[PDB]
């Protein structure tokens, strides 16, 4: 630790000192009878910011909490630690890589890694007035997209085959803990049936199975992209096929 000069008033019969967590944060020198403090030097973890090996092969190191004086060897002391290998600019853009405490970092003009202070958005004031109203005149249809997970993979584990193997004395020893495997198998079977119920209650909400007409006269709208095509072996539409090939 770091033995510094104390400020606590020991009574002349005490030796150690302790914090609110019961560890020595003070000592009495056994020769000169002086009181000293103790502060450790276990100082933070290390992160590396990289814009991707595909783009470039230069990185910026971030020491999560140091005063930038204890690092071994372009140093910039932020509020989230010590950034080594990045220039601090005075502009403000969107956040590409987050550093913490409103600091981000991006690969940008050659080119380097910059560490600005992120911006919230394009500021604009509204022209409010006690007799002024803005009415729209033309519109726009927009088709967004929202992804939602429904179920994960069902699994099952046979303890005495995982824990033990093709050994019988190992199973005779596992007998000393009788209900653990049964607990585990019960939990996993509950999880499996829960996943099946999840899928069942998300999708199966129609009583019948409706059928689109053979003549597609929808007033101009074209649903041929989301309606199924009989040509494909399965009955998945074009978008569903485009989805089932992007998830490995």
């Amino acid at each position: 630790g770091v033995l510094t000069e104390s400020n606590k008033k020991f009574l002349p019969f005490q030796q150690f000192g302790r914090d609110i967590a019961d560890t020595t944060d003070a000592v009495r020198d056994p020769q000169t009878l002086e009181i000293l403090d103790i502060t450790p030097c276990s100082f933070g973890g290390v992160s590396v910011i990289t814009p991707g090996t595909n783009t470039s092969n230069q990185v910026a190191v971030l020491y999560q909490d140091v005063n930038c004086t204890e690092v071994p060897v372009n140093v910039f002391q932020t509020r989230a630690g010590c950034l080594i290998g990045a220039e601090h600019v005075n502009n403000s853009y969107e956040c590409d890589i987050p550093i913490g405490a409103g600091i981000c970092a991006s690969y940008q003009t050659s080119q380097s890694i910059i560490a600005y202070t992120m911006s919230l958005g394009a500021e604009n004031s509204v022209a409010y007035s006690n007799n002024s109203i803005a009415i729209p005149t033309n519109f726009t249809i927009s088709v967004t997209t929202e992804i939602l997970p429904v179920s994960m993979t069902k699994t099952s584990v046979d303890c005495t085959m995982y824990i033990c193997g093709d050994s019988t004395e190992c199973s005779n020893l596992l007998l000393q803990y009788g209900s653990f495997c049964t607990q585990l198998n019960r939990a996993l079977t509950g999880i499996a049936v829960e996943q099946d119920k999840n899928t069942q209650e998300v999708f199966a909400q129609v009583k019948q199975i409706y059928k689109t007409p053979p003549i597609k006269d929808f007033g101009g709208f074209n649903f041929s992209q989301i309606l199924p095509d009989p040509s494909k072996p399965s009955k998945r539409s074009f978008i569903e096929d485009l989805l089932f090939n992007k998830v490995t």
Binding site: I20, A21, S42, D65, A80, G100, A101, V126, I133
Partner: protein
């Protein structure tokens, strides 16, 4: 307390969004609401007088517009007085922030217990690795060190599991808060007792 915990590997990362940025977000939401009605959560903010917006909102709960314009002073006075009462209720010893305080208290207790667990023998001859290492030969000290290792790893497992469950709960509450922000602020709601108590 803070550094006392910090001195055993425990760290505390700072939030990505500083408090001034959150304050600016709420300021933007509030200014957009009071200057443009609800038309800024569905496109671009379309300015409109405030009395006419409050009349658009009165008309949304089945009460004609002609009750606002003929009772505008009274409603203004009632709203100002309600805000004053809100102040007088928060600016006193009336401690109603239990939700935000129990979180801090629970995390502080979890960390205090985790750091206090470092002072138990768990069966070994001591509770300090340096002591056992300096007064015992390795081939014998392995058993004591291993008892301590198993104890500390068990306690850390328990802490991580408690944190996972608390984080799931906080995630649920944050989804609820985002839903309330998106349906009560950026538009008038009609779900009973979702955005208040009464006609919203």
């Amino acid at each position: 307390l803070i550094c006392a915990q910090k001195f055993n590997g425990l760290t505390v990362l700072p939030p990505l969004l500083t408090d001034e940025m959150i304050a600016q977000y709420t300021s933007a939401l509030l200014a957009g609401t009071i200057t443009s009605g609800w038309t800024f959560g569905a496109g671009a903010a379309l300015q409109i007088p405030f009395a006419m917006q409050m009349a658009y909102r009165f008309n949304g709960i089945g009460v004609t517009q002609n009750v606002l314009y003929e009772n505008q002073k009274l409603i203004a006075n009632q709203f100002n007085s309600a805000i004053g009462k809100i102040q007088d209720s928060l600016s006193s010893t009336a401690s109603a922030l239990g939700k935000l305080q129990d979180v801090v208290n629970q995390n502080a207790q979890a960390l205090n217990t985790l750091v206090k667990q470092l002072s138990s023998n768990f069966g070994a001859i001591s509770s300090v690795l340096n002591d056992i290492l300096s007064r015992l030969d390795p081939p014998e000290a392995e058993v004591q060190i291993d008892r301590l290792i198993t104890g500390r790893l068990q306690s850390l497992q328990t802490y991580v599991t408690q944190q996972l469950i608390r984080a799931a709960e906080i995630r649920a509450s944050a989804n609820l808060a985002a839903t309330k922000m998106s349906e009560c602020v950026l538009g008038q709601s009609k779900r009973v007792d979702f955005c208040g108590k009464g006609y919203h």
